[PDB]
A paper describes a structure:
The non-LEE encoded effector protein B (NleB) has GT activity and inhibits NF-κB activation by transferring N-acetyl glucosamine (GlcNAc) to host death domain-containing proteins and to glyceraldehyde 3-phosphate dehydrogenase (GAPDH). The glycosylation target is an arginine residue, which was unexpected because the guanidine group of arginine is nucleophilically poor at physiological pH. The T3SS effectors SseK1 and SseK2 from Salmonella typhimurium SL1344 are NleB orthologs that behave as NleB1-like GTs, although they differ in protein substrate specificity. Here, by using a combination of X-ray crystallography, STD-NMR, enzyme kinetics, molecular dynamics simulations, and in vivo experiments, we show that these enzymes are GT-A fold retaining GTs that most likely follow an SNi mechanism.
Based on the complexes of SseK2 with UDP and UDP-GlcNAc, we identified the donor-substrate binding mode and substrate-mediated conformational changes. The uridine group has an aromatic ring tethered by Phe203 and Trp65 through π-π stacking, water-mediated indirect hydrogen bonds (backbones of Arg68 and Ser346), and hydrogen bonding with the Phe66 backbone. The GlcNAc moiety of UDP-GlcNAc establishes hydrogen bond interactions with Asp204, Arg207, Asp239, and Arg348. The acetyl group of GlcNAc stabilizes the manganese ion by water-mediated hydrogen bonds. An octahedral molecular geometry was visualized for the manganese ion coordinated to six oxygens from the UDP pyrophosphate, Asp241, Ser340, Asn338, and a water molecule. The SseK2 structure undergoes a dramatic conformational change induced by donor-substrate binding. After UDP-GlcNAc binds to the active site, the α10 helix is tilted towards the UDP-GlcNAc by ~ 3.5° and the C-terminal lid domain covers up the active site to stabilize the bound substrate and to restrict the accessibility of water molecules. The closure of the C-terminal lid in the presence of UDP-GlcNAc determines a closed conformation for this family of enzymes. In the SseK2-UDP-GlcNAc crystal structure (chain D), Asn272 (corresponding to Asn256SseK1) is closer to the C1 anomeric carbon of UDP-GlcNAc (5.1 Å) as compared to Glu271 (5.6 Å). These data indicate that the Asn272 may play an important role in binding and catalysis.
Numbering used by the authors: 40 to 348
Amino acid sequence: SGHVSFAGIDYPLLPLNHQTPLVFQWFERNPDRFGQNEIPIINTQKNPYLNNIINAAIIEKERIIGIFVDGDFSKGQRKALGKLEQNYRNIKVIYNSDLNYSMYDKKLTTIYLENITKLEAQSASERDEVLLNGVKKSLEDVLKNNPEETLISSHNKDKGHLWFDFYRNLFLLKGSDAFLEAGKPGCHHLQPGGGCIYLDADMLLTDKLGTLYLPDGIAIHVSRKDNHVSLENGIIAVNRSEHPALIKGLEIMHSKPYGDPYNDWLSKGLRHYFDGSHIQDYDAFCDFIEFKHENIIMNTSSLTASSWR
Ligand SMILES: CC(=O)N[C@H]1[C@@H](OP(=O)(O)OP(=O)(O)OC[C@H]2O[C@@H](n3ccc(=O)[nH]c3=O)[C@H](O)[C@@H]2O)O[C@H](CO)[C@@H](O)[C@@H]1O
Ligand SMILES: [Mn+2]
Ligand SMILES: [Mn+2]
């Protein structure tokens, strides 16, 4: 087929051709745990993530493979990453410090003040007074510690998995263009305003992916463990920059206090985008949105060990 229907609307199954880059991510909170000439990406027996990435680059020879990294890497470590790119010409190491996300950002005071106003406009007998008090306390904390804290500055390395989860969604907003904005060479055959296929480093390719067809050009991982189905992070495929489903999620992150990249940006953003009146089941949405591929063994860490839990 060439279209699918969901919540009463028809959506074309849009192509992500074999150009569309794959993107892995490695945000490293403690790069001093690697040798100062070692590639600072986990590569243990239980988490063989650099090998998995290399193995994907070998399989997907004709396609760019981005590694989206962050952390306080040594010069020697950056040179080891440069050497990886020499050894596998399709790998492009993108430093999160080389991208500008200011167009997506918002001050935490602003979010808190907007939520306080809205709550105080509601009657005392109507409103969520516990929330109102929680938000006023978050505001006090920010004003005391760092008044200029923003959504983005707040999702830093000190926040565990929130650091990489938040920045992953930001990178997906940029899409293919992030390769160009970070000054990566040999990325000029990427489509301008193009998309990418984000994969967790334990999503093992066993053979080429080829051309993908996704509804409205978007799809996400679903777990089926079991008998059980949920949206999951860990595969995010888009055919274009600023996918409106992801923009919708960002609007939720800008209006909610305590917005979560998984629960709010990704899950509610997508579901509110494709099924805003909530007329169809969640399991049906999972089926509609599911990234399916027979040449990926998905989430292999859950059969071994989590790299951060
Ligand atoms: C549910 C699922 O199928 N995958 C998610 C799961 O990972 P899970 O719990 O499955 O953990 P994994 O070991 O697969 O690591 C997932 C990914 O997180 C990133 N990573 C991990 C550790 C680290 O120090 N630095 C780093 O950047 C990497 O991109 C890695 O690929 O929870 C993570 C944290 O909410 C999400 O990010 C993953 O998308
Ligand atoms: Mn089903
Ligand atoms: Mn995993």
